[PDB]
Amino acid sequence: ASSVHWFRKGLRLHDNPALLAAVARCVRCVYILDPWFAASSSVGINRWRFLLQSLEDLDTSLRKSRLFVVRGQPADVFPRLFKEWGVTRLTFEYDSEPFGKERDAAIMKMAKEAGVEVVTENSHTLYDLDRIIELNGQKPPLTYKRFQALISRMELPKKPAVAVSSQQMESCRAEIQEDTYGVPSLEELGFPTEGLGPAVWQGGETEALARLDKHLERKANANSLLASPTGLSPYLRFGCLSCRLFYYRLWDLYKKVKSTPPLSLFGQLLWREFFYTAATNNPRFDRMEGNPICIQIPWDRNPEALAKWAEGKTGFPWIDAIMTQLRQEGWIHHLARHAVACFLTRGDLWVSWESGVRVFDELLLDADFSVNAGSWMWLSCSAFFQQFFHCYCPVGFGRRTDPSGDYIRRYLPKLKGFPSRYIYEPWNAPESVQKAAKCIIGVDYPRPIVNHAETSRLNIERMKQIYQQLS
Fold this sequence. Notes:
- The chain is mainly alpha-helical.
- The chain has helices spanning 17-20, 35-38, 45-63, 78-85, 98-113, 129-135, 144-152, 205-215, 233-238, 243-254, 267-279, 303-311, 317-329, 334-347, 353-363, 369-379, 396-401, 406-411, 420-423, 431-437, 452-467, and strands at 2-6, 26-33, 67-71, 89-93, 117-121.
- It has three domains: 1-123, Rossmann fold, CATH 3.40.50.620; 124-160 and 205-282, Serine Threonine Protein Phosphatase 5, Tetratricopeptide repeat (Alpha Horseshoe), CATH 1.25.40; 283-468, DNA Cyclobutane Dipyrimidine Photolyase, subunit A, domain 3, CATH 1.10.579.10.
- It is globular.
- This is Cryptochrome-2.
């Protein structure tokens, strides 16, 4: 049995049953990368860089074999690799997402006809999303409260699976000392790296394992808005870090500060689970029309407002600071997500959450089909039976989360001089202070593109008239 282990998500060696499930004569780990699909992506540098870096340290974490990065599409590549390498077993980590499943079905059948036996394990999520779905009347739980009550009636998730030992990793190796299966660079993928600077969120399993022990440091606010070195969201999205490891390593630490915890200690993960679960069987999950759980709301098709939002040229420092940090770094705090999402959708521009999905998909490291589409539907009150809460003022919420104005100042430098008392609402500053800050509103930095008081009174009506012909 000469097996192939296919990395798609799940970019780790720890907790990988599917990798075990391939390790018993010869084994190759591959990843399929279409280089001019990448060259044409529209997904920004930050994600591609995190992807490559994940792949590079994994190539390192295999040298102790190597990593084959096959170029091409999954179809018309696996047939070659089958006949050429002589392949029996194809293994990979399961993919709950509509596209993935349907793609993975084709491969399994296309592997079946060719006499290749497929085995897939489930380690991206804590649970078996299908197990949750049955236990709940064969439908997905449409409220997080519902989803939670059922997570406590159930059996604690599987524990982190024993990572592969060096003893098998010198029994079924291989090599052909040419790197033609070498991991590409950003330039290779059609990216310009003119004075890049190091990533803020370095990709990879080694980073994520390092970050996981710094995070679970026992003894431990604008600070929180800034990228944390203990932060773990991108590593979960790509799978450099197992969510099950993260689970029980919380549990083993929670038990060292005392019982059995509320489901909220796993807050980061249960929302994630919930969104995955809600999406497995929902092909149109990231869309308004044709989606059985999304409320049909008349958003404004409005490219210009969208672009201004996307580019951090609203009149609002707090919004623009957020979008600026997003474009540059690939991560923004959850509460900042809420701010820009509410602004784009029901709070201010009344633009479709789908458009929000698309921008975050391009810029945000931890976004995937399920979590990203899920968050936006929640935020825009489009799904998940939500009590419409209920405003983030594009001014007030900024002042409230960081009165100093040090978040704005770091990200919108052309606004440095402004006193805290005006930094969130620069247009309300007299020409005196504007001048002394070296920043004339309407010139160095745009005026606000909506009157928020007038806009949110308006939009409140619209949503109400939606829910009233519904309830």
